[PDB]
């Protein structure tokens, strides 16, 4: 009777995980972004409006992890599998707060207000993971156009510390797969990935399939220079030659998204000369 107010706390900590309560139902409804969780009323109308207040905060997280952690595993080598896997990592650490709250529930040491003040920065973290998961389903994006969207994120938006903070890490960690094969195309003239993400897929030195559906991760200026490099790198394929001339542009690594223009320019004049 007063006890039941603590009992709905313990039922709340399961919503955040994404699973069934002991007196709060979980509906794994069709559609994502919003599935509805049906809160069974109990006597004292005030603590029920209060729980209803904190309820959307657990809800918007619980949908977005679910479909993207399984969808990622189905990816063929593409940057969206490195991306969905990095989300799952940040999703472990959200659950640390769920279990730290349940550690303070051995007897009631928290109330519904004391929970909200704690997930107060994690509300700005979750709402910016929320638009990622919706934008990459709208396009039905593949690996070249995924990175095109995430680029503007790491160079736009402000409002919380913790929102920009997460959004540096995960956008570099989507670009970093791309970079590893980037040095593989711009020096070795091979793709490892099943679908390349660049301006061109593989094939005189105009015999290419231009996909615009998979384009480079930045602005088009480096993309024009990625095509030009692959022309020098085609000539050596055209009639055999030393393809082990580049390695002195590989003693140092690339790894930039604040000055991708410089490393691609240094990857261009190096490829012009060894020809």
């Amino acid at each position: 009777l007063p006890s039941q107010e603590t009992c709905l706390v313990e039922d709340l900590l399961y919503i955040l995980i994404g699973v069934d309560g002991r007196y709060i139902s979980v509906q794994p409804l069709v559609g994502r972004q919003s599935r509805s969780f049906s809160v069974e009323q109990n006597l004292d109308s005030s603590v029920k409006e209060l729980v209803n207040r904190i309820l959307p905060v657990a809800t918007n997280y619980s949908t977005v992890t679910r479909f993207v952690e399984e969808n990622s595993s189905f990816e063929y080598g593409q940057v969206n599998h490195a991306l969905g896997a990095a989300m799952r990592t940040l999703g472990k650490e959200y659950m640390i707060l769920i279990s730290q709250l349940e550690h303070l529930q051995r007897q009631g040491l928290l109330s519904l207000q004391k929970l909200w003040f704690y997930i107060q920065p994690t509300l700005r973290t979750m709402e910016v993971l929320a638009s990622i998961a919706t934008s990459l389903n709208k396009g039905e994006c593949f690996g070249g156009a995924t990175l095109s969207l995430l680029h503007d994120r790491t160079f736009g938006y402000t409002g919380d510390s913790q929102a920009q903070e997460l959004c540096l890490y995960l956008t570099k960690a989507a670009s970093a797969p791309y970079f590893d094969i980037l040095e593989r195309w711009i020096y070795r003239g091979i793709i490892n990935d099943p679908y390349s993400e660049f301006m061109v897929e593989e094939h005189w030195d105009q015999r290419y399939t231009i996909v615009q559906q998979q384009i480079p991760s930045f602005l088009q200026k480096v993309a024009d220079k990625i095509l030009s490099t692959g022309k020098y790198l085609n000539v050596v394929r055209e009639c055999g030659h030393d393809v082990t001339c580049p390695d002195a542009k590989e003693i140092t690594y690339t790894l930039k998204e604040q000055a991708y223009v410089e490393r691609i320019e240094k990857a261009y004049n190096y490829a012009s000369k060894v020809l």
Partner: protein, 294 residues
């Protein structure tokens, strides 16, 4: 309370615990079997479901081998790799049994996220065995290397280390046959096979068919074409007694060094560093082959 806490530790070590479900097949599932039912107990049994079954997939394979001499190369080296991740599965289960019994706490939300780093690890490792249930060394080497093509660098390092160890007999088949001509394959699980045809005094006759249908995805086809002549050119100097490594003796030291060097590290399959000195063997055995007649 404590009964279902102790059940799920015992499914992690095998099957059963306090109740009977007895799934040695199927998809393993936990039935609480109590009069005390709550709806969070339904979600905890579906937690257990793919933890215990994916553990059982490793047991289905290494007992399917039943450690034997038939496929005592690659097939059982793969069971060997899976036995190194069998142990580590038991290890997060022993620090949870140390919390329970006096050294206390039950399973909670703490422990609930702790296991989920194994959970994703066992989806890779259960998928690695699902890929290849054949019993040939060549198509095992094309299967587990193709599961390294996928994204996710957390599981790329995890499989890369399985792949070095599936490969530990495979490169051990390779360089001895290249320098000298040595074989142990009587089952033909070496991707390069032997004796389809009768064995007569050499005159460049056949005794190797490398099989254009089973080449390891870490090797390239134009290189498998080069090593085929290397095996033939040295075995064709079995009509002289010089069975040594051709030209430089600096190649013979390498195989002996290399088998310890691969063990000691993190089980990395070198498949573009290896390709450098097998070029230099093709270059060795061709001036040697003309210099014994000279």
């Amino acid at each position: 309370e404590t009964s279902l806490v102790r059940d799920l530790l015992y499914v992690f070590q095998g099957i059963d615990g306090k109740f009977v479900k007895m799934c040695n097949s199927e998809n393993c599932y936990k039935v609480d079997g109590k009069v005390a039912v709550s709806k969070s107990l339904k979600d905890i049994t579906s937690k257990l479901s793919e933890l215990g079954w994916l553990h059982n997939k490793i047991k289905k394979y290494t007992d399917q081998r039943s450690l034997d001499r038939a496929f005592g190369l690659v097939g059982q080296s793969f069971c060997a790799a899976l036995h190194q991740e069998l142990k580590e599965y038991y290890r997060l289960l022993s620090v949870l049994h140390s919390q329970l019994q006096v050294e206390s706490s039950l399973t909670l939300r703490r422990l609930l996220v702790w296991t989920f780093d194994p959970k994703i690890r066992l989806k890779t490792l259960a998928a690695l065995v699902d890929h290849c249930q054949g019993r040939k060394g060549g198509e095992l080497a094309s299967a587990v290397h193709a599961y390294t093509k996928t994204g996710d660098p957390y599981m790329r390092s995890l499989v890369q280390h399985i792949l070095g160890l599936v490969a530990y007999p495979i490169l051990n088949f390779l360089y001895r046959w290249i320098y000298d001509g040595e074989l142990e394959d009587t089952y033909h699980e070496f991707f390069v096979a032997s004796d389809p045809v009768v064995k007569t005094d050499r005159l460049w006759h056949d005794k190797y068919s490398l099989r254009k249908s089973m080449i390891p995805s870490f090797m390239t086809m134009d290189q498998s074409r080069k090593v085929l002549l290397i095996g033939k050119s040295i075995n064709f100097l079995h009509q002289v007694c010089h069975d040594q490594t051709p030209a430089s003796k600096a190649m013979a030291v390498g195989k002996s060094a290399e088998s310890p060097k691969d063990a000691a590290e993190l089980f990395t399959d070198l498949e573009n560093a290896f390709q450098t000195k097998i070029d230099a063997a093709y270059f060795d055995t061709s001036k040697y082959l003309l210099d014994v007649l000279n």
